Structure 1
Amino acid sequence: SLQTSFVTLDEAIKITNRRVNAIEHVIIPRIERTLAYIITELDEREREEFYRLKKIQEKKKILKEKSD
């Protein structure tokens, strides 16, 4: 009753320790280096609107001094 209990646990500990090592080394470092890509792609648009808005801030002054 323990000999047939011994080998059925080593078939269920191996197909569990792979799913630990599939999450730890494949699923999470795919999500982690995706989340590092959303951060920089947010940043490359947050400095893109800083160039368009500062262009209007200079063009609101040149149009002002043309009136003055």
Structure 2
Amino acid sequence: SLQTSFVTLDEAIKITNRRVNAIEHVIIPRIERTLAYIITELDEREREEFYRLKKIQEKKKIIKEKSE
């Protein structure tokens, strides 16, 4: 009984360590990279919106100068 438990636990340990390593070396780093990319691209959207609004504000100022 001891030997059978030992062998089966050996298999279980190998599989579980392979799962844990798979997660922490593939799945989690993949998600972390995707999160970094998402944050950067959202910063880009915000920057573009900022530029467009800045441009609109400048054009409104120029309109004030054109009217006055």
Tell me the TM-score normalised to structure 2 length. Answer: 0.96
Q: CA RMSD in A?
A: 0.6
C-alpha deviation, 1:22, in angstroms: 0.4
Runs of 4+ in 1 over 4 A off after TM superposition: none
Tell me the TM-score normalised to structure 1 length. Answer: 0.96
Question: 1:28 matched to which residue of 2?
Answer: 28
Structure 1: runs of 5+ lacking an equivalent: none
- Between the aligned residues of both structures, percent identity stands at 97
Structure 2: runs of 5+ lacking an equivalent: none
Give 1 or 2: higher helix fraction: 2
- Report SS of the residue matched to 2:12: coil
C-alpha deviation, 1:13, in angstroms: 0.5
